[PDB]
């Protein structure tokens, strides 16, 4: 009861003493969250402007005789005739290893009701990515836990992989599984929700808490009722919190949810400011809006991190991985925003509705999903093994037009269909249960060497699950040997083959 | 002081006040000579505000004096609004006299904070085969009925009211937003013919009214529901509240009509640039919080049978269970016309509905998808080019499509057959057998417009 | 928007007046014209659709009486052709601002909680001369709404020591 | 659950300060309204002149 | 309220205040006011003919296409 | 003599000067406070010029003093710019120190006139078997690398640079117009490893900079290449320079973004009115002249795999060859992965390449495009039921597809540092023999991953 | 008259009881008949149920035909 | 049990707010702190103002 | 019977207003307890006329260039 008294006494006696000249202005026009001011001759572009009621704005248009500024609170309490002041500052958010497990607003204000956030640093929201000289090549793997993604569309540390597909196909589920799979890799995660109803955000937070994956995750929530400025600014303020770890030797992973909704919010902001529209009524500079956001996700060399920390973190190298999410209308990837985003990222993962209904979950479309980093982002064993899967799917996809006519074909193509159907059935996987690299390796090897050729298609999933459980039980040391390192020698292959043979002989799934 | 009118462009008046006494953003103004009520929208500066009219603007001059109330629109709430019909401004239009309450609440309010977000999953059995099997509801979650023009959104909503509200022990609110007045009269007289009129409060800003009325009408409808939710009786718990809205699409449509008049650049097709925000502000107040639960049913129109249109495509993200109606199925004679491949729900997972139900639903969807894929080959080539498994799948899929048909309790006026109410266990048992092949010897015409699986066998024997 | 459209006319008028050494006459004429066009009845009689621009210029000449000349008549004729007569007050304000700036004279407004006597006003005038202007035109304004202190407004620059201290301390408290 | 208890403690301790500060500020404003004289006004405006 | 015309320039308005004689400087001489993307807007040129061949100081050649109320695109 | 900033909107700045001193078009302005640099685009009257910013537009006030330079943007040129990395304005960004030279040229220049065009069209040979046979380049031509999923297109570019360098001492320029920083860094490190950095100059606009950079990096690189060409050494003859533009698609969109704000109405698909003008101005300086030549290789991005929109359609008018990479051909184990049937060139003409070259190319194309048609028949029936003719076609087409494989010298891993650089005559002899049938008895696995026919003969005899 | 897409949301309340109780699911009968006939154009089996439905749909379709200015009662 | 403990904490919170009410009335003499102390102690003259 | 005629050569305003005049003429009987029946012919042409009227007023159009409130018409 007295510590608060001492704090308030010393604070009151500390300041609130002097008088300072300031540069003011007068509100003139208020509508739809946009405010115009006559004055502020010294207003900077992007500067933070205060209002009389305590609200905070951001100056975007600096016209000849007026300044258009958005409002970061609710604008319904503002009236014309009030006054605005320039603060000579820029938007900043708190960063550090204290936001882990917390849910924050777009400005770093705790909304989960668990008390204040004690953060010892603040960093600018608008920054620039490191130059081309400080980067380094991408050669470290980020496991997502899906047998299809990790074998055919690999993701490295520092890559920027896009997740694109129609509504209700499992994009958010893939992102959350990727976050969950990072339990032991020791890479911090940041999840940004843009334009989502608060119930879904709460459900996602609860699901992350149930699995214990919230101990190292920070959630930034700009819900659907929040002003357009917050939905426009949220990804940048999440990226800053992510970059805190990159510049200090540690690894991070950030997931922007529905960049389409950020684009929509920015379109609403730009149209109300009377800027000329382009195709689909978007402003001309949407590409520059997304580029300076996605380009910050990178991997920096040990020299850069050593320079940044003045010699505290000499040995290591940083990174930051991004998983932007886009939604398309009826698979129309020729629209404006998806075309812009596809150009920037290092790959994509197409999710199809027709594949989702047919039972293939996840609905990853292997025909048009690529990863430009490619093989360099995989562990040795999975890199060695994925070739059979890739070629089997390629062959099964070349002649999928005749799939219903297997009765009228030769023997070679019929065998190709028989194997392609089985490998396709292999890629199915449940939700919230990711596979370590050993499970993927065992399953893929069992598929490559034809040990699945004598089991009917309807029973492959049970076969695979039983095989993985059998290995988890009998062969714990081998599984830990593969998981720990990722090696692939004659010893490992012989052990895997012996285990598979003993399973087929003596288990009867 | 008081201002005067200087422009009248359709439904968008604008008034000039003194430099000191300009009103706030959502204040309410009253024209002196008439009963028109204005709501400020923008504040153009230099003592000029731009408002919209809550009534007809015929016969309004320029220079009529306007006085301010210095407060937003206020509607009555409480138990005195139960069994009453009300308009936008909360004035009784059933000619039963003035409402006997004194409580007031502004219709413009912020959504509940993220801290007070209680989400529950307690199943709700509606007695409709396709709804129960494919897209189960949850007590306290938001539901939507997407569909074109004339495919049966309203009939499905009136069916869900019959199966739930009659057995429901708790209040309700029906808010019609730009719909047929005949439907409102029919609903009022249907509730009054039964004895459940004392459990509903009705708000009707209908399709014959100026856009000002259709715009700020849903807000009153859920302003009453918010008070019903956040209420406690001593030695009593919170009351479960239902909320039925009809064509929430009309709410955005009425905002589009007055968009250009407010001086905004048009968005992608013709919509206002603030479509997503002005839909979110409304949709975020419907959730259920730590005190009270609001079960919401909303029919959502689909312009020109186009699910890609910006408004239906924006509404999807705000709902838990989405039921999509199809015109092809309705034109094929199957009622209800629910599309089994577009209906989804967050409640369809093994940890909520159980393993068996989830497996049955996924198998049904897989069969329907494979039939949908085969439908193209059997058109160019014949049915006899397929293998035997594919022909079997085609027959089973046609039987499944027929078996989702059902006679509703409220649709017996159109056809004549009495309605049926199928429990969930009967649906699951019937579909398990139908997938197992036990009913391969039943002609597909026996699966049409029947209840449980026993009626199918009885009808097959009668044939 | 209105201020933007008044830049060239005001600048041209000020340049011509300064080069002809008749700034005071133009200032008086511009104030009179701004007051006239601000009037409701005169503006209503001025915007009649039958009037050619020459008629409007002649009407302005009649209402202005003396102080008119070929310069002001030509200026009004040029304004009328482009239909910019409505924005005369902004032109007058811009002209006054330019004239004050050229004379190195800036305007200040001192708002206090109590009426001031001569010595305080002279002291503040002397203090503001450290802004290095020709003179300050101090227009004192009493405000009982305040409690104590004086706030001075010079263009867009304000210096505050009044009850705003209370709000500044309140924000730091919360 | 223990962490939730701790968060409740911190929440209450944070909440009380807001009312405390608000009431103190209002009392201060009442004191300054009670004081009505120009000598304090004259004293500190004369202070400001040299403060420039 | 429309945007500024090319003829609304401080120097031109000052000249107009000066005197209105010479009939816009002999009706066959202009003055460039705008230059952008291969288009030049001229002030004056009363006797300009739609499609006429205009010569500039440098030795170039233009062609008047828009003969507007107070300016001449070329 | 100096002006003030009076308006900032996005990246479009406005400056007001004294009417007597107004900078010309494309002049360079330097804001006094900061390191930002502007360039003039238009003149709006009253001494007002509208510009765009080459760098950070954040932190710029209004009424901020601006001084002029009275000349366009001048960049350093000479032999001192070899092995460095530079931004648009010519400032080093590799932190190796200031660029030690004093020769500078403006980046904006007129295209070469009609009189000084090259009197002939020489043939440029690389050594890659696919390109030198089916898609021959031209000395001072223009080559596009269309399509291609994530594949070694960068590998192809450094192979090309290594081949041009080790064969000819001519220099090179790489100008990444809106390139991913990861790929640029990988390219720089590869050039540093192979000791080829002594002969390359680089310019980078890194996709997250204001559109002025991504707009003028290409012109900076082109100016550097022009200076390299125009230098006449020890005889009176200029060099032969090679210029890369890693993404020409970014150049159009860089001007598209600024077009709307500059005050221009849109066009067909939202592009600027001057799309063809900008493309011509850029692409008309890349030609072979009487003294020296500039040949170019430009990767081109096709948005949504639709090459009928104006962005690649206006590029197609300038290209002399189109090398189309493919996903499947790289998947099948063919490393260079150039599509034989689709990739074409304007240089495949019996007048310029002789008659045997043209006839061999035509025969190979016919064989390949008949084998591609036989695919469905082979898949359905098998190889046994085909005629005796069209089996030879299958075998020879498979052999040809294998023989397009090539080991890449710069790899040095998994290959064995196998620099081949086969002379064109060897490939002509080999394919003439293969089409004729002298090698019809050799297993197809011998034709894989070798150079000339001597190597395939040796490999076949060894096995 | 396309029996597939045509409705009267008033329904049977708008006709005298004779027509109200006589006309049952006639409209839905024709709606299903249209789709069945379109799907079974090439059906070589034609089990008795489908044959009866197709032989009744044609009767009902040919039933509803009349000439200009020929009002029934 | 947490409700039991926090319903003791809050039952003490009336007394804590009375404590800090005395403390805040004593802080109300930071209207002197804002002041240049022209009236270095103007509040001691009359402090009837009732605050919780 | 009463016939209200707005032909193809009539100004677009007359075509826009004709159905409202017809409805007002028909409502005389409805308000006084007498039944009536009105037949609007080619409301699509009324929609075209209203689109022409709105476009000439420079109002932004929606789908198929129809004005925003073609539904409220
Ligand atoms: N591997 C899987 N096995 C079973 N179900 C899955 C699997 N993957 C995804 N799903 C299911 O897909 C359903 C719908 O997909 P999801 O919940 O991920 O939404 P979404 O793709 O993010 O779409 P939107 O953005 O429109 O909300 C989920 O309820 C989830 O249970
Ligand atoms: N469950 C049903 N079964 C059979 N026919 C139906 C059913 N529901 C509606 N119909 C018919 O289809 C149409 C549905 O229209 P209605 O439900 O009233 O509103 P909406 O225009 O929103 O679709 C009506 O003609 C109705 O008679
Ligand atoms: Mg999602
Ligand atoms: Mg309807």
- What is the SS3 string spanning chain F? CCEEEEEEECCEEEEECCCCCCCCCCCEEEECCCCCEEEEEEECCCCEEEEEECCCCCCCCCCCEEEECCCCCEEECCHHHCCCEECCCCCECCCCCCCCCCCEEECCCCCCCCCCECCCCCEECCCCHHHHHHCCEECCCEEEEECCCCCCHHHHHHHHHHHHHHHCCCCEEEEEECCCHHHHHHHHHHHHHCCCHHHEEEEEECCCCCHHHHHHHHHHHHHHHHHHHHCECCCCCECEEEEEECCCHHHHHHHHHHHHHCCCCCCCCCCCCCHHHHHHHHHCCCCEECCCEEEEEEECCCHHHCCCCHHHHHHHCCCCEEEEECHHHHHCCCCCCECCCCCEECCCCHHHHCHHHHHHHHHHHHHHHHHCCCHHHHHHCCCCCCCCCCHHHHHHHHHHHHHCCCCCCCCCCCCCCCCCCCCHHHHHHHHHHHHHCCCCCCCHHHHCCCCCHHHHHHHHHHC
Please give the method by which this entry was determined: cryo-EM
Buried b (16+ CB within 10 A) or exposed e, B307-332: bebbbbbbbbbbbbbbbbbbbebbbb
B428 with B403: CB under 8 angstroms?
no
What's A459's domain CATH number?
1.20.150.20
In 3D, which of B394, B410, B405, B463 has the Cα closest to residue B430?
A: B405
The topology under which CATH files domain C2-100 is: Peroxidase; domain 1 (1.10.520)
Q: D22 vs chain A: nearest CA distance in angstroms?
A: 12
What's E37's domain CATH number?
2.40.30.20
Check if B152 has its Cβ closer than 6 Å to any atom of ligand 2: yes
Neighbours of chain B (3+ CB pairs under 8 A): A, G, I
Distances (CA, A) of A195 to A225, B6, C12: 8, 39, 52
* A385 and A366 housed in the same domain: no
In 3D, which of B308, B311, B77 has the Cα closest to residue B298?
A: B311
Helices (H) and strands (E) in chain B, counts: 15, 18
In 3D, which of F26, F337, F365, F83 has the Cα closest to residue F224?
A: F83
* A146 and A39 housed in the same domain: no
| Closest CA to ligand 2's atom 11 | B152
* A471 and A455 housed in the same domain: yes
In 3D, which of F397, F401, F394 has the Cα closest to residue F449?
A: F401
Q: What is the DSSP string of chain E?
A: -PPPPTT--HHHHHHHHH---THHHHTT---EEEEETTEEEES--TT--TT-EEE-SSS-EEE---B-SS-EE-
Structural element, H or E, at residue A306: helix A302-308
Closest in I61, I68, I72 to B259, CB measured: I68
Q: Which domain holds residue A19?
A: 1-92
F149 is in an annotated binding site: yes
Count of residues in chain D: 52
* Contacts with E71 (C-beta within 8 Å, 6 or more apart), sequence order: E5, E6, E7, E33, E41, E42, E43
Question: Token pair of A488, please?
Answer: 């692939």
Q: Measured between beta carbons, which residues in chain G are less than 8 angstroms from residue B416? A: 12, 21, 24-25
G26 with B413: CB under 8 angstroms?
no
Is E64 among the domain residues?
A: yes
Is E74 among the domain residues?
A: yes
| Closest CA to ligand 1's atom 13 | A170
In 3D, which of F370, F361, F369, F362 has the Cα closest to residue F390?
A: F370
As a whole number of angstroms, the distance between CA F360 and CA F330 comes to 24
Closest in A23, A54, A63 to C157, CB measured: A23
* A80 and A97 housed in the same domain: no
Strand partners, B13: B8
As a whole number of angstroms, the distance between CA F81 and CA F202 comes to 9
DSSP-H helix ranges across chain I = 12-31, 43-56
Distances (CA, A) of F158 to C70, F153, F297: 77, 9, 12
Check if G10 has its Cβ closer than 6 Å to any atom of ligand 2: no
Q: Which domain holds residue E66?
A: 10-74
* Contacts with F317 (C-beta within 8 Å, 6 or more apart), sequence order: none
As a whole number of angstroms, the distance between CA B390 and CA A38 comes to 73
Strand segments, DSSP code E, in H1-52 are: none
B176 is in an annotated binding site: no
F254 with F271: CB under 8 angstroms?
no
Other CB atoms within 10 Å distance of the CB of residue F283: 23
E34 and F264 within 8 Å at the Cβ level: the answer is no
* A124 and A234 housed in the same domain: yes
E36 and F45 within 8 Å at the Cβ level: the answer is no
Number of domains in chain E: 1
| Secondary structure, 3-state, A441-507 | HHHHHHHHCCCCCCCCHHHHHHHHHHHHHHHHHHCHHHHHHHHHCCCCCHHHHHHHHHHHHHHHHHC
* A100 and A216 housed in the same domain: yes
Number of domains in chain A: 3
B443 and G49 within 8 Å at the Cβ level: the answer is yes
Domain positions in chain B are: 1-72, 73-347, 348-463
F78 is in an annotated binding site: no
* A415 and A440 housed in the same domain: yes
Question: Token pair of B167, please?
Answer: 């057995």
* A448 and A304 housed in the same domain: no
Strand partners, C111: C141, C151
Ligand nearest to the CA of B347: 1
B410 with G6: CB under 8 angstroms?
no
B303 touches chain I (CB under 8 A): yes
Q: B415 vs chain G: nearest CA distance in angstroms?
A: 6
């Amino acid at each position: 009861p007295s510590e608060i008294s001492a704090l308030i006494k010393q604070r009151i006696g500390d300041l609130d003493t002097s008088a300072t000249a300031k540069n003011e202005g007068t509100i003139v026009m208020v509508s739809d969250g946009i405010v115009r001011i006559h004055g502020l001759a010294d207003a900077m572009y992007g500067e933070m402007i205060e209002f009389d009621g305590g609200l905070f704005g951001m100056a975007l248009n600096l016209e000849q005789d007026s300044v258009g500024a958005v409002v970061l609170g609710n604008y319904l309490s503002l009236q014309e005739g009030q006054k605005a002041r320039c603060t000579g500052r820029v938007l900043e958010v708190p960063v550090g290893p204290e936001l882990l497990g917390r849910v924050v607003d777009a400005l770093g204000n705790p909304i989960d009701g668990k008390g204040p956030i004690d953060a010892k640093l603040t960093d600018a929201v608008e920054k620039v990515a490191p130059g081309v000289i400080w980067r380094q090549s991408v050669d470290q793997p980020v496991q997502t836990g899906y047998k299809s993604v990790d074998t055919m569309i690999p993701v490295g540390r520092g890559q920027r992989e896009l997740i694109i597909g129609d509504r209700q196909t499992g994009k958010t589920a893939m992102a959350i599984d990727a976050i969950i799979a990072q339990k032991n890799s020791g890479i911090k995660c940041v999840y940004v929700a843009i334009g989502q109803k608060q119930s879904t955000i709460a459900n996602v937070v609860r699901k992350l808490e149930e699995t214990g994956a919230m101990a190292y995750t920070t959630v930034v929530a700009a819900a659907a009722a929040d002003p357009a400025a917050m939905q426009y600014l949220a990804p940048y303020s999440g990226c800053t919190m992510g970059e805190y770890f990159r510049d200090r030797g540690e690894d991070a992973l950030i997931i922007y949810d529905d960049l389409s909704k950020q684009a929509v919010a920015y379109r609403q902001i730009s149209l109300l400011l009377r800027r000329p529209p382009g195709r689909e009524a978007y402003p001309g500079d949407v590409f520059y809006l997304h580029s300076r956001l996605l380009e910050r996700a990178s991997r920096v060399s040990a020299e850069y991190v050593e320079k940044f920390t003045n010699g505290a973190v000499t040995g290591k190298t940083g990174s930051l991985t991004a998983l932007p999410i886009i939604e398309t209308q009826a698979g129309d990837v020729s629209a404006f925003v998806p075309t812009n985003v596809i150009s920037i990222t290092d790959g994509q993962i197409f999710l199809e509705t027709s594949l989702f209904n047919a039972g293939i979950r996840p609905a990853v479309n292997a025909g048009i999903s690529v990863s430009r980093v490619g093989g360099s982002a995989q562990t040795k064993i999975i890199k060695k093994l994925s070739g059979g899967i890739r070629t089997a799917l390629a062959q099964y996809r070349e002649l999928a037009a005749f799939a219903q006519f297997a009765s009228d074909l030769d023997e070679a193509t019929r065998k190709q269909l028989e194997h392609g159907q089985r490998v396709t059935e292999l890629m199915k996987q449940k939700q919230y249960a990711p596979y370590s690299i050993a499970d993927q390796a065992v399953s893929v090897y069992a598929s490559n060497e034809g040990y699945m050729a004598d089991v009917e298609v309807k029973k492959i999933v049970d076969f695979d699950a039983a095989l993985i459980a059998y290995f988890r039980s009998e062969y714990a040391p081998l599984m830990k040997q593969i998981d720990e390192t990722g090696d692939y020698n004659k010893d490992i292959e012989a052990a895997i083959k012996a285990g598979i043979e003993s399973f087929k002989a003596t288990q009867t799934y | 002081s008081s201002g005067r009118i200087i422009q009248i462009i359709g439904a968008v008046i604008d008034v000039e006040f003194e430099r000191t006494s300009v009103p706030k953003i959502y204040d309410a103004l009253q024209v002196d000579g008439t009963e028109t009520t204005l709501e400020v929208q923008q504040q153009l500066g230099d003592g000029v505000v731009r408002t919209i009219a809550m009534g007809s603007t015929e016969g309004l001059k320029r220079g009529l004096t306007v006085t301010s109330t210095n407060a937003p629109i206020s509607v009555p709430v409480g138990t005195a609004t139960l069994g009453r019909i009300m308009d936008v401004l909360g004035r009784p239009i059933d000619e039963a006299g003035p409402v006997a309450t004194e409580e007031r609440l502004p219709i413009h309010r912020q959504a509940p904070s993220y801290a007070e977000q209680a989400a529950s999953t307690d199943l709700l059995e509606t007695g409709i085969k396709v709804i129960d099997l494919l897209c189960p509801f949850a007590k306290g979650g938001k539901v939507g009925l997407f569909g074109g023009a004339g495919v049966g959104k309203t009939v499905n909503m009136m069916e869900l009211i019959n199966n739930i509200a009659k057995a429901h022990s708790g209040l309700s609110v029906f808010a019609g937003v730009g719909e047929r007045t005949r439907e409102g009269n029919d609903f009022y007289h249907e509730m009054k013919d039964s004895n459940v009129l004392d459990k509903v409060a009705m708000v009707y800003g209908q399709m014959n009214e100026p856009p000002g009325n259709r715009l700020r009408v849903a807000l009153t409808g859920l302003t009453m529901a918010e008070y019903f939710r956040d209420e406690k009786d001593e030695n009593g718990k919170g009351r479960d509240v239902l909320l039925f809205v009809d064509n929430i699409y009309r709410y955005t449509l009425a905002g589009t009509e007055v968009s250009a008049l407010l001086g905004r650049m048009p968005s992608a097709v013709g919509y206002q640039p603030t479509l997503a925000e002005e839909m979110g502000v409304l949709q975020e107040r419907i959730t259920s919080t730590k005190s009270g639960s609001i079960t919401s049913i909303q029919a959502v129109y689909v312009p020109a049978d186009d699910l890609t249109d910006p408004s239906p495509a924006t509404t999807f993200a705000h709902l838990d269970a989405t039921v999509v109606l199809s015109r092809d199925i309705a034109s094929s004679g199957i009622y209800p016309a629910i599309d089994p491949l577009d209906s989804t729900s967050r409640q369809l997972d093994p940890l909520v509905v159980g393993q068996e139900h989830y497996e049955i639903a996924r198998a049904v969807q897989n069969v329907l998808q494979r039939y949908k894929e085969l439908k193209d080959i059997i058109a160019i080539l014949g049915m006899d080019e397929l293998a035997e498994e594919d022909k079997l799948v085609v027959y089973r899929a046609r039987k499944i499509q027929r078996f989702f048909s059902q006679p509703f309790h409220v649709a017996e006026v159109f056809t004549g057959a009495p309605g049926k109410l199928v429990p969930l266990k009967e649906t699951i048992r019937g579909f398990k057998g139908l997938l197992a092949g036990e009913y391969d010897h039943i002609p597909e015409q026996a699966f049409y417009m029947v209840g449980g699986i026993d009626e199918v066998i009885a009808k097959a024997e009668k044939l | 928007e209105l201020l933007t459209l008044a830049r060239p006319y005001a600048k041209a008028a000020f340049a011509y007046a300064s080069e002809q050494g008749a700034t005071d006459n133009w200032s008086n004429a511009l104030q009179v014209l701004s007051a006239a066009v601000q009037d409701e009845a005169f503006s209503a009689y001025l915007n009649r659709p039958e009037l050619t621009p020459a008629e409007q210029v002649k009407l302005f000449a009649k209402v202005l009486g003396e102080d008119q000349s070929q310069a002001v008549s030509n200026f009004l004729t040029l304004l009328a052709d482009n239909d910019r007569l409505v924005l005369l007050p902004e032109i007058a304000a811009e002209y006054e601002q330019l004239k004050s700036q050229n004379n190195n004279n800036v305007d200040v407004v001192i708002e206090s909680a109590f009426p001031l006597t001569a010595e305080q006003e002279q002291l503040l005038k002397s203090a503001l001369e450290k802004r290095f202007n020709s003179t300050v035109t101090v227009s004192v304004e009493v405000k009982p709404e305040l409690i104590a202190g004086v706030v001075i407004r010079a263009g867009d620059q304000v210096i505050d020591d009044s009850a705003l201290n209370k709000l500044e301390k309140m924000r730091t408290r919360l | 659950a223990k962490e939730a208890v701790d968060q409740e403690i911190n929440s209450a301790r944070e909440e009380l300060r807001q009312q405390v500060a608000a009431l103190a500020v209002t009392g201060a404003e009442k004191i300054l309204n009670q004081q009505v004289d120009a000598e304090a006004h004259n004293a500190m405006l004369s202070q400001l002149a040299a403060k420039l | 309220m429309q945007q500024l015309n090319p003829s609304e320039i401080s120097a031109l308005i000052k000249q107009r205040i000066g005197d209105l004689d010479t009939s816009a400087t002999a009706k066959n001489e202009g003055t460039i006011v705008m230059v952008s993307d291969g288009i030049v807007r001229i002030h004056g040129l009363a006797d300009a003919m739609y499609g006429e061949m205009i010569e500039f100081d440098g030795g170039l050649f233009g062609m008047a296409l828009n003969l507007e109320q107070d300016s001449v695109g070329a």
